[PDB]
Each structure stands twice: as C-alpha cells, then as structure tokens.
Design an enzyme around this catalytic site. Sequence first.
Site, PDB file in Angstrom:
ATOM      1  N   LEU A  44       0.833  -1.211   0.000  1.00 33.89           N
ATOM      2  CA  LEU A  44       0.000   0.000   0.000  1.00 33.89           C
ATOM      3  C   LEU A  44       0.866   1.260   0.000  1.00 33.89           C
ATOM      4  CD1 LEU A  44      -2.831  -0.954   2.540  1.00 33.89           C
ATOM      5  CD2 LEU A  44      -2.916  -1.034   0.048  1.00 33.89           C
ATOM      6  N   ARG A  46       4.839   3.211   1.594  1.00 33.07           N
ATOM      7  CA  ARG A  46       5.846   3.325   2.644  1.00 33.07           C
ATOM      8  C   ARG A  46       5.868   4.752   3.180  1.00 33.07           C
ATOM      9  NH1 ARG A  46      10.534   1.002  -1.480  1.00 33.07           N
ATOM     10  NH2 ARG A  46       9.822   2.167  -3.327  1.00 33.07           N
ATOM     11  N   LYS A  48       6.571   8.118   5.722  1.00 33.73           N
ATOM     12  CA  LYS A  48       7.706   8.902   6.228  1.00 33.73           C
ATOM     13  C   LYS A  48       8.614   8.183   7.243  1.00 33.73           C
ATOM     14  CE  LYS A  48       3.901  10.596   8.780  1.00 33.73           C
ATOM     15  NZ  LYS A  48       3.251   9.374   8.228  1.00 33.73           N
ATOM     16  N   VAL A  52       4.343  -0.233   4.569  1.00 34.68           N
ATOM     17  CA  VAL A  52       2.982  -0.675   4.881  1.00 34.68           C
ATOM     18  C   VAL A  52       2.357  -1.535   3.791  1.00 34.68           C
ATOM     19  CG1 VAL A  52       2.566   1.288   6.400  1.00 34.68           C
ATOM     20  CG2 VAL A  52       1.929   1.426   3.994  1.00 34.68           C
ATOM     21  N   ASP A 155       1.978  14.571  15.658  1.00 37.63           N
ATOM     22  CA  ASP A 155       2.271  14.527  14.225  1.00 37.63           C
ATOM     23  C   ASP A 155       0.996  14.655  13.375  1.00 37.63           C
ATOM     24  OD1 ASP A 155       4.002  14.545  12.098  1.00 37.63           O
ATOM     25  OD2 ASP A 155       4.610  12.444  12.256  1.00 37.63           O
TER      26      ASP A 155
HETATM   27  O1  LIG Z   1       3.306   6.162   1.360  1.00 37.03           O
HETATM   28  C1  LIG Z   1       2.027   5.520   1.478  1.00 37.03           C
HETATM   29  C2  LIG Z   1       1.819   4.979   2.901  1.00 37.03           C
HETATM   30  C3  LIG Z   1       0.338   5.041   3.328  1.00 37.03           C
HETATM   31  N1  LIG Z   1       0.180   4.683   4.752  1.00 37.03           N
HETATM   32  N2  LIG Z   1       0.995   5.010   5.623  1.00 37.03           N
HETATM   33  N3  LIG Z   1       0.658   4.603   6.741  1.00 37.03           N
HETATM   34  C4  LIG Z   1      -0.487   3.942   6.633  1.00 37.03           C
HETATM   35  C5  LIG Z   1      -1.299   3.290   7.549  1.00 37.03           C
HETATM   36 BR1  LIG Z   1      -0.822   3.241   9.377  1.00 37.03          BR
HETATM   37  C6  LIG Z   1      -2.468   2.676   7.125  1.00 37.03           C
HETATM   38 BR2  LIG Z   1      -3.548   1.799   8.414  1.00 37.03          BR
HETATM   39  C7  LIG Z   1      -2.826   2.712   5.772  1.00 37.03           C
HETATM   40 BR3  LIG Z   1      -4.434   1.853   5.234  1.00 37.03          BR
HETATM   41  C8  LIG Z   1      -1.999   3.373   4.845  1.00 37.03           C
HETATM   42 BR4  LIG Z   1      -2.466   3.436   3.003  1.00 37.03          BR
HETATM   43  C9  LIG Z   1      -0.824   3.990   5.293  1.00 37.03           C
END
Ligand SMILES: OCCCn1nnc2c(Br)c(Br)c(Br)c(Br)c21
Length: 334
Positions: A44, A46, A48, A52, A155
């Site tokens: 899905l 990554r 900062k 993920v 944050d």
């Molecule tokens: O750079 C793209 C990362 C997107 N991203 N980052 N942290 C996430 C969490 Br925590 C959840 Br739960 C979900 Br759903 C998503 Br999609 C997330």
Amino acid sequence: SGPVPSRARVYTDVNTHRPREYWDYESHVVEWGNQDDYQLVRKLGRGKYSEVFEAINITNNEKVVVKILKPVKKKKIKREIKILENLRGGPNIITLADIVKDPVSRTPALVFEHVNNTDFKQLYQTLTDYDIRFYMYEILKALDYCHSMGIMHRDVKPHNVMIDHEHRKLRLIDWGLAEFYHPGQEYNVRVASRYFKGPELLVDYQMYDYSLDMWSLGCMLASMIFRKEPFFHGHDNYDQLVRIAKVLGTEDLYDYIDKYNIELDPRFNDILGRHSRKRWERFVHSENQHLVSPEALDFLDKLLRYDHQSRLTAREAMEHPYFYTVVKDQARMG
Ligand SMILES: OCCCn1nnc2c(Br)c(Br)c(Br)c(Br)c21
Ligand SMILES: [Cl-]
Ligand SMILES: [Cl-]
C-alpha cells in the site's frame, strides 16, 4: 533562570489518576503474536517512517493492514503499542489488531484494521465547504478522545488522516511520535513536520501539551480553505517561524516569548525582526471565496495562537459555530 512552567488547561491529570501500568510504557510486557497468522497481499506504500502492506488474517479470513516498523529503539516501539492499546475503540482512531515479529529478522510489525488507501491530502483537491467542516470535526473527535485519554499525537497532518470519502469515514494514523501527557514534564521539540510544528517547538519550548495538536489542525484548515499547500511554507525551522510571524505578526510572538521566559538566539530576534499582523481575509481572493466564511476565519483565528494555552481545546473547537450545522446534521444520520 530558565523558563516559566506551563500546565494543560484540560485533562491535566488523567494519567495521574490512573494506575501506573496505564502510562508507564517502559514496564509493559508485549505479548507478541504469531507472524504466520498474516500473509502480505500488496504494498500500500511506505510512510515517512515505515513500510505498509495490505494483508490477510488466515485465522479469520479478514483483511488487515500491516506496518513493518522502521529500525527504531525498543523505547519507541513500546510507547506506540501501549498508546494504541489504550486508544482502542476510540472514535476515529485506527485500532491495533495484533503485534507480531519477523522470524529471522526480529523486526516488529504493527497490524491494524483495514481502512483505505486514500489519505486526506490526496482527497483535499475536490472538497466542498461543508466537506472541510465535516472532516475537520471527525479529526477533533479523535483529538479530543486521545487528549481525554492523556495522549498527544504530535504529528497531526494531512498524510496521517485516512479518509473514505464515500462512506463518510475517517481515521487518524501513525501514533509512533505520540506520547503520554504528564504535568511538569519536559518534552522533546523534534516532533511533527516543519509546516505543522507549533511556535513552542520552533522556539525550543519544552513544557508543551495537548494544545500542540490544535496548532497543527489549524495549519491544515488554513491550507484547506485558502488552497495554499502548506499555508506556512518554511524552508528551514528558522524560516517557518518567520513565515508564521508574517501572518500573526511579531507583536504577539514576543509577548509569548517573555510570558513563558523563553530564551533563544539573539539573531533569531533580528531574523524575525518586526512585522505587522495580517487579517485572515487577506489570504482570500480568487477561487477560494466559497470556502471561507466568517465562522471559518474566527475558528482559524482561535486555533492559530502563538500562546499554546490560549488555543481552543478540541472540545471547545467542536462547539464553534463552524460546525453548528455539522453537529446538527449528524444528529439525524451520524
Ligand atoms: O506512502 C504511502 C503509505 C500510506 N500509509 N501510511 N501509513 C499507513 C497506515 Br498506518 C495505514 Br492503516 C494505511 Br491503510 C496506509 Br495506506 C498507510
Ligand atoms: Cl518527548
Ligand atoms: Cl483538547
């Protein structure tokens, strides 16, 4: 000499009235689950500070979102999980499902309830005036719950709000910088992202509180209604405060500085210098007049205060006229 002390106005001792094991994350023993329960489906993304995945729980055939943690200290690991366990079932807060560990690598991975790919930043370029209100209110529900439970997020920004536009659902994610609020405690200024860091952080003031999140929320709204991403566009930490000064004015900034007996570099005062305040209407002009109302500008004015103690609390914000129809609208549907 040092600075003057500060106290949070609301929820000041919610951790003091609770048992030690609630907030003492250093003494928690993490019962680690089984990694085999979860199989990765697709990336899905990554964030900062993590990577993920979409995942499937083979024990119940439900979908989960797995977040393999950044190579971080065990002190940060335990703080986040203990905060997520305590915030479980809260309105609009992502709920930890399980926590597992890689067999060979021994790198930890948080497992969550599945929500959606769509963060609030990607969805912000198609929102009506009532949508801004609606989704801001949902963020305050999450912010008042986490404050009421004794936790600052630290944050708050667009990327960390997940939103399903169709179902009117919303979640606040990434609690890895969050912390428990304790009176008299000095907190580290290295939290949040430049554009959403409050003046307290940029002036190296340590004894801050829940009000920091309310600054950040103002930064979002401002950018949302004026369609300037981000609304305070600093280049470095010095410049961020200098941008803020160019809107709120330098007069209240130096009142904030002396009041709490805050010390900083002489050249910061020279860098900032003197600059007049700008009324909130001056950031309106062309293709954003529809988004800015009087109640929006008052609300915004009351969130973006130098003085962290003066800023509206989440509950106070929820009572603002800006949401009047929003709270009334959800009383006949939810
Ligand atoms: O750079 C793209 C990362 C997107 N991203 N980052 N942290 C996430 C969490 Br925590 C959840 Br739960 C979900 Br759903 C998503 Br999609 C997330
Ligand atoms: Cl800290
Ligand atoms: Cl609050």
